[PDB]
Design a protein around this ligand. Sequence first.
Ligand SMILES: NC(=O)c1cccc2c1OCCO2
Length: 119
Amino acid sequence: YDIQAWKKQCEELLNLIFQCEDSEPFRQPVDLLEYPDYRDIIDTPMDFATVRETLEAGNYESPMELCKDVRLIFSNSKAYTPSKRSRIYSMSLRLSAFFEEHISSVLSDYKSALRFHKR
Ligand SMILES: NC(=O)c1cccc2c1OCCO2
């Protein structure tokens, strides 16, 4: 029932993601010189460094907010890819499966803690 425990849990999950080779294309904003049409397709860029900095600045109020920004990394990849068989898209699909497997208990525990506080 610790209402604050989600923040260190999210820090530790981001550490795991940064050690995974599949995260390398997504660690920093997409290079607009390498991909000059990116902003013709993608309205809101997102990357894992931006998520970690937002967390460390104290600008997420809940893990739901962090989870929305991480899911935007993956939806951007699915919208920008020219093929379902692209290398970088394949990497995002594996990394999304790993993230969803690990974020499930962080969300559950937070929502349980809030319900206990309200009881
Ligand atoms: N196939 C790709 O080039 C691509 C495919 C999916 C996501 C991307 C991609 O390139 C820029 C970074 O984000």
